[PDB]
Structures are given as structure tokens and as C-alpha cells.
From Swiss-Prot:
Chain positions found as PolyADP-ribosyl glutamic acid: 16-17
CC terms in the record's Gene Ontology section: blood microparticle; chromatin; nucleoplasm; nucleus; pericentric heterochromatin; site of double-strand break
Span of domain JmjC: 136-302
Protein name: Lysine-specific demethylase 4D
Major subcellular site: nucleus
Cofactor section: Fe(2+)
Entire protein: shown range: 11 to 341 of 523
Residues that, per the record, bind Fe cation: 182, 184, 270
Residues given in the record as 2-oxoglutarate binding sites: 126, 192, 200, 235
Location(s), subcellular: Nucleus
Length: 331
């Protein structure tokens, strides 16, 4: 078995190897990359997502989210308070202000220490889930707005034709902005490209150990657990690496820098934070190996997680028994 310790792998495709996305994902899995839950892909040196970022300040963040924490430093929830719209130019200025800017630090490790020590005492503002793309239409390789769609994969593998579309989202982050412990909708893959700015640190649990994280989460968030049998779908819970180590949960960590892709694999729980002002783009995708994960994915039926138009069809076709009760939560 390849990569038995489930380490995060880093790949350096040639420009030749960068032409066929599906084939490269299948290559990575042949080397065991999926066992980690997360992989880094460094694009060939000849490749670019676009010519410059010089004109992005006029993108609108229509609903910036202020991420308010409750709990203790290593075990907390966050709630998202909606703020008034602002442009990317306004947001970047806010991120760079004395109140919100990255503090002085020695290196990534010192900054990670400061994050876990101090996150709960601040409420950074996150521009999340903004439909759009920053890839130039002329970028032909690994353009996240030109991937084959999940609906087309399900059609190719299973023969069923369904409604729905699949488009990318932009994320504008600042120091301490946080993504809570989650897997993707329907335990899909995700791919994330860091277009610009400061790094993003990721934590990940190997898919084969995801249930260990869920069991810990039920112990640490016991009222949330009683309210919903898949409460990590709410994307509100944080657990520090110290806490994970104290409870024996297998995990890994890695820092993504501007110009790098990350791929998350089906049922790979992940969480993380941003080091300072940045802009990432991400989208879900599928392969044939995903299908069985999609059939087994947990669902939130309490009604909090409230998810896309396209997820309907996935649940309807892959999880017909659940369909009924899931859509009671969604309506
Ligand atoms: O970048 C972020 O804030 C969150 N992204 C993801 O969870 C992802 O790409 O799967
Ligand atoms: Mg603009
Ligand atoms: Ni994700
Ligand atoms: Zn729920």
C-alpha cells in the first residue's frame, strides 16, 4: 500500500504532466496521496493563473462575515456575523489596519503558536463563498473555472442525467480568518488555488480515520452533537493541534503559499487559518472513486447546514432513502 503513514504529499508536475487534470489526480492517488486527505501541487514554473492581479480591488464582497469565537483557546465555535458590503480594495485596507494586521513573528511556527493562543480574543472579517473566478480564460491548464462538472462525472459513471451546475468560489482572508473542521458537501474533493497574498495553514485528518475526529467532536461539543447527527456540516467547530494530540487523533499540517494548489480528498476532514491578506479560489470536483463516498456521506437534517441547489440531485440519486428527510431540513 502506498503512503501507509498517510503523510501529506507534495507534487511538482512538469508542463507536460499539467495538461490532463484527471490523469494527474489519478497519478497522485496511485502514489497514495489521498490517504493523507490533502495534497499540495506546485505548478510548473512556466504556468500562470493570470498576467497580473492589478485590477481586483473592484470585486465586491457583498456579505463580509465577522467570525466571533466562543469557548476556550483550543476548543471553540465560531459564528458568522454579517457585515455591510465592501470592495476588495476596502477589505485589503481593513486587513492591513493596525486592528487586524498580522503581528510581528519569527516564522510560520511562531505565527501558528500565536494563532492558537490568541484567536478567540479577536473577530477577524472573512469574505467567503463569493461566486466567481480569477483565472484568465486563456489559462488552459488547471483553470478552476474550466473543470469537468460533477454532474457530468455522475452521468459518465452512472448514466443518469441531472440538473445542477458547479462553479468556483473566491475567498478573501485576513489574519486569523478561520475555516472550521469539515469535509466537503457529499464528501466531494475540493481544489483550492492561493492566487495572492499571505499563506494559509491547513490541518487534515486521514479519511480512514475521520470517524475518530467525529467521536472526539461529539465529546467536545456535546449539545451540538445532540442537536444534529452531522453537526460538523455546520462548519463552526475548531479543535487545536494540541487538543488533537492530547486525544490521539491522527492528523497532519502544511502551509500553502501564493501560487500553490491544494487538493482535499473525499472524507478528508480539514480546518485552517490565514496568515494575512489573501485571495483563494476553490471548487468541488469528483472522480470515479468519489462515487462510493458520495453514497455514504452524512447529512445535516436539523436545517442549519443549508446547502446548494446542485446538492439536491446528488442526494436524490445517490441517497434516495435519505432524500425525503434531508429535504425536510432544506425546506
Ligand atoms: O480557503 C478556505 O477558506 C476554505 N477552503 C476549503 O475548505 C477548501 O478549499 O476545501
Ligand atoms: Mg476589480
Ligand atoms: Ni473545504
Ligand atoms: Zn445540522
Amino acid at each position: 500500500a502506498q503512503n501507509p503513514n498517510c503523510n501529506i504529499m507534495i507534487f511538482h508536475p512538469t508542463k507536460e504532466e499539467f495538461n490532463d487534470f484527471d490523469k494527474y489526480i489519478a497519478y497522485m492517488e496511485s502514489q497514495g496521496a489521498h490517504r493523507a486527505g490533502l495534497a499540495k501541487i506546485i505548478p510548473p514554473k512556466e504556468w500562470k493563473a493570470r498576467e497580473t492581479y492589478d485590477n481586483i480591488s473592484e470585486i465586491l464582497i457583498a456579505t463580509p462575515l465577522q467570525q466571533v469565537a466562543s469557548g476556550r483557546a483550543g476548543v471553540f465555535t465560531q459564528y458568522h456575523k454579517k457585515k455591510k458590503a465592501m470592495t476588495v480594495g476596502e477589505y485589503r485596507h481593513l486587513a492591513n489596519s493596525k486592528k487586524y494586521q498580522t503581528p510581528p513573528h519569527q516564522n510560520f511556527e511562531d505565527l501558528e503558536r500565536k494563532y492558537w493562543k490568541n484567536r478567540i480574543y479577536n473577530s477577524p472579517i472573512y469574505g467567503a463563498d463569493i461566486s466567481g473566478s480569477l483565472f484568465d480564460e486563456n489559462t488552459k491548464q488547471w483553470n478552476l473555472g474550466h473543470l469537468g462538472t460533477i454532474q457530468d462525472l455522475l452521468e459518465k459513471e452512472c448514466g443518469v442525467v441531472i440538473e445542477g451546475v458547479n462553479t468556483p468560489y473566491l475567498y478573501f482572508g485576513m489574519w486569523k480568518t478561520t475555516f472550521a473542521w469539515h469535509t466537503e458537501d457529499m464528501d466531494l474533493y475540493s481544489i483550492n488555488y492561493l492566487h495572492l497574498g499571505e499563506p494559509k495553514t491547513w490541518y487534515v485528518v486521514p479519511p480512514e480515520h475521520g470517524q475518530r475526529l467525529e467521536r472526539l467532536a461529539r465529546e467536545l461539543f456535546p449539545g451540538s452533537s445532540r442537536g444534529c447527527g452531522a453537526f460538523l456540516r455546520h462548519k463552526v467547530a475548531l479543535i487545536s493541534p494540541t487538543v488533537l494530540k492530547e486525544n490521539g487523533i491522527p492528523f497532519n499540517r502544511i502551509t500553502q503559499e501564493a501560487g500553490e494548489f491544494m487538493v482535499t480528498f473525499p472524507y478528508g476532514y480539514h480546518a485552517g487559518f490565514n496568515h494575512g491578506f489573501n485571495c483563494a479560489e476553490a471548487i468541488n470536483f469528483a472522480t470515479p472513486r468519489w462515487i462510493d463516498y458520495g453514497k455514504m456521506a452524512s447529512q445535516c437534517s436539523c436545517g442549519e447546514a443549508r446547502v446548494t441547489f446542485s446538492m439536491d440531485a446528488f442526494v436524490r440519486i445517490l441517497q434516495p432513502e435519505r432524500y425525503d428527510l434531508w429535504k425536510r431540513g432544506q425546506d
